[PDB]
Design a protein around this nucleic acid. Structure first.
Ligand SMILES: [Mg+2]
Ligand SMILES: [Mg+2]
Ligand SMILES: [Mg+2]
Ligand SMILES: [Mg+2]
Ligand SMILES: [Mg+2]
Ligand SMILES: [Mg+2]
Ligand SMILES: [Mg+2]
Ligand SMILES: [Mg+2]
Ligand SMILES: [Mg+2]
Ligand SMILES: [Mg+2]
Ligand SMILES: [Mg+2]
Ligand SMILES: [Mg+2]
Ligand SMILES: [Mg+2]
Ligand SMILES: [Mg+2]
Ligand SMILES: [Mg+2]
Ligand SMILES: [Mg+2]
Ligand SMILES: [Mg+2]
Ligand SMILES: [Mg+2]
Ligand SMILES: [Mg+2]
Ligand SMILES: [Mg+2]
Ligand SMILES: [Mg+2]
Ligand SMILES: [Mg+2]
Ligand SMILES: [Mg+2]
Ligand SMILES: [Mg+2]
Ligand SMILES: [Mg+2]
Ligand SMILES: [Mg+2]
Ligand SMILES: [Mg+2]
Ligand SMILES: [Mg+2]
Ligand SMILES: [Mg+2]
Ligand SMILES: [Zn+2]
Lengths: 71, 111, 47
RNA sequence: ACCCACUCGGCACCUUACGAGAAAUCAAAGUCUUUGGGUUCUGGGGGGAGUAUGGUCGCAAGGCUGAAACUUAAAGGAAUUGACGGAAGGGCACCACCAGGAGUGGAGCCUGCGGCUUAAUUUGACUCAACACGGGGAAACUCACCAGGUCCAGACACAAUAAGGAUUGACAGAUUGAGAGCUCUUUCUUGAUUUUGUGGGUGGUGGUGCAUGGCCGUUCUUAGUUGGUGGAGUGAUUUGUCUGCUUAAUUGCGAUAACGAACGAGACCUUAACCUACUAAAUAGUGGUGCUAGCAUUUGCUGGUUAUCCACUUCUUAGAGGGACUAUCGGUUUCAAGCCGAUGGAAGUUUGAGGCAAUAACAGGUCUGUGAUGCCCUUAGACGUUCUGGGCCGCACGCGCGCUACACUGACGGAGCCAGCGAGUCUAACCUUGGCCGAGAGGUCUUGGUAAUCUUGUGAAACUCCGUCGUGCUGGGGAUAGAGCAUUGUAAUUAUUGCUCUUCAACGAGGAAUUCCUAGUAAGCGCAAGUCAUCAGCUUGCGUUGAUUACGUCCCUGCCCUUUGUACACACC
């Protein structure tokens, strides 16, 4: 055959990061829980799931894609 | 390879077959392909009687070394034919006459 | 000889075979039997 | 001199074999395990080797005498059977010739093969038995090639990670050929399904057809193989199975230490021929009558009418039978098998044509048909797989299968107008009539058909007729190219095909070579089927028109058969 030419530069798939996750429910004091990170408006999402915060962005992850909700 | 084949041939023959044939093609233990014919009794290889009497099958026996052919051919006693022609087209039988008591000046009987 | 006698047992096995000698359930309907309630919880839709 | 008989002693030959031999063979090579007439010489596995050394002879070259170490399991004899031979003798055949046909070989293009080119131009095959072959007519797919982008569909076993998250997905934006979260930016989501590592699997048009199955091609357009009782040999074997004769045939006749047999050939099977005789039919069809149109009238002639009825089976159809068995007679021959001619016959070339087809052989082709397969290689930056685009068509040239032509037995324009084998749409867009629109290509509205019912009488083509052209590359020929319109398909650019106009090449019967063919055959012609969304210059069948020439020979070629040689038997690679 030929056996391995290539121009270097391989790729990596994904880390998924690490992220100890939910430290985000904000209490005030003892024991009131004020719950940061607003929750999604669609029936498939039972308000357990939330919206991410970027520039211009509030995004539901439980919708894999669907329903951009902007505020 | 013989003991098995020859064993088959004996059972088929004893099962009343006019004849049968066993072929083994492949490679056993020797890197080169060899083949054996095993056949007994009577078989015709040509014509319509082929379809009528002989029954064949091939079978691939897959083993460690490789794969062998089993080609088996069984010919059935045409006498027993049941539904079909009861002999080869070859067969011609003449019926056997009977001794006569000739002469006997004519006379006649009555009723 | 070992082939001929091979067919001795082929006849034997053939001649001795010429004569020789509820969990009720039904999982089709068991899910219909287990259809009894107190099997779930649904409440949602805040804010 | 010659003839006949007889007898000694010669050179030989013939036939037997009592007898001998391992056998070929031997009146000695016989009278040898039932071993003794006399006598001389030589040999004791194959090499080493007639070498070394000594002695002796010779002018010489060389003669006589003549070891050993070491090496090696065979060397060797006669015969049997195969294989082969650039030996002899017999055959067979249009993949051989003769007598001829029609051609290829020259020309343009079509197609395949080599070559070169290429990022890649995927690859198998190289005399008959590679090269219009792989059903191989590749725009994606196909696809195996090249340029680049994804995904695991890495079972399962242990181990590691980890319920504080093992892992999964993605909006926009960057990015990308791309509304692929491929990757990255930000950070939601997901819940033990994955992940990481090892072991172990799995896919591969990756290698090996020189590891195989199976299949197929070839030997083979051939006629060979074998066993029973008997004859010969110690035996492997042989005779049967053969000079001749005859057949397409080891088909027979005849000769015969053989007789009578089986596989193969033959029989058989299919298809094309023949049925006024049997069984029938609105899904085939005729006659008669109602209904009905036109022309003539004197009764006639030529049509319409899926059922207005009655009758029938010649034509059509396919079940069952009949028929041919080279019959009758006559020529010729061992008056044998056969052969030939004539009459009759639907049929007399194995009736024509196929299918089936023994033993055996090849390192023939196929791992690129197969979830047939051993083993090798590869297996996440993949030789797995998928997506995007390209390539298999690339063009100084050599080879091969074809197609269309060079015209007046013709092109062309009108018109006469005649087949057969097929195929055709259910969870569907197949075969398509008819009416419109359009020069055409085609478009549109509908309709019959799962089919002897509709397409379809497939009104096909060559061909027949009446004209235009008049030998001038002409109006023969249609290569090449421009310009426009359509159709298939997501896609047509390197132009899928179709239509119209214009352009109007080579080719004026083709050197040496070489293919194919003996009757509804050749050749000319178009049709249907496969392939197929679109694409036949291909193939497989079909019918149409329909000749010239053999009816022989072994000259060329090819291949069988004996005879003969063999030191080959892995068999002349
Ligand atoms: Mg036979
Ligand atoms: Mg036959
Ligand atoms: Mg003797
Ligand atoms: Mg000639
Ligand atoms: Mg010629
Ligand atoms: Mg060819
Ligand atoms: Mg592609
Ligand atoms: Mg994917
Ligand atoms: Mg693994
Ligand atoms: Mg491993
Ligand atoms: Mg494979
Ligand atoms: Mg190879
Ligand atoms: Mg081979
Ligand atoms: Mg093979
Ligand atoms: Mg011929
Ligand atoms: Mg012989
Ligand atoms: Mg009839
Ligand atoms: Mg006649
Ligand atoms: Mg080879
Ligand atoms: Mg294969
Ligand atoms: Mg090609
Ligand atoms: Mg004309
Ligand atoms: Mg128009
Ligand atoms: Mg001209
Ligand atoms: Mg013209
Ligand atoms: Mg000519
Ligand atoms: Mg077609
Ligand atoms: Mg083809
Ligand atoms: Mg010999
Ligand atoms: Zn949501």
């Amino acid at each position: 055959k030929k056996v391995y030419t290539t121009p270097k530069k391989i790729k990596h798939k994904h880390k998924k990061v690490k992220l100890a996750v939910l430290s985000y429910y904000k209490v005030d004091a003892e024991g009131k829980v004020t719950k940061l990170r607003r929750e999604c408006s669609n029936p498939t999402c039972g308000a357990g799931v939330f919206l991410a915060n970027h520039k211009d962005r509030l995004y539901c992850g439980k919708c894999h894609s669907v329903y951009k909700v902007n505020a | 390879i013989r003991r098995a084949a020859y064993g088959v041939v004996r059972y088929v023959m004893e099962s009343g077959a006019k004849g049968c044939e066993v072929v083994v093609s492949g490679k056993l233990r020797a890197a080169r392909a060899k083949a054996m014919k095993f056949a007994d009794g009577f078989l015709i290889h040509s014509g319509q009687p082929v379809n009528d009497f002989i029954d064949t099958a091939t079978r691939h026996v897959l083993m460690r070394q490789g794969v062998l052919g089993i080609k088996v051919k069984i010919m059935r006693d045409p006498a027993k034919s049941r539904t079909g022609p009861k002999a080869l087209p070859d067969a011609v039988t003449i019926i056997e006459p009977k001794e006569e008591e000739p002469i006997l000046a004519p006379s006649v009987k009555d009723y | 000889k070992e082939a001929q006698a091979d067919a001795a047992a082929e006849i034997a096995e053939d001649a001795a075979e010429a004569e020789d000698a509820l969990q009720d359930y039904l999982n089709q309907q068991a899910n219909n039997q287990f259809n009894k309630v107190p099997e779930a919880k649904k409440v949602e839709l805040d804010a």
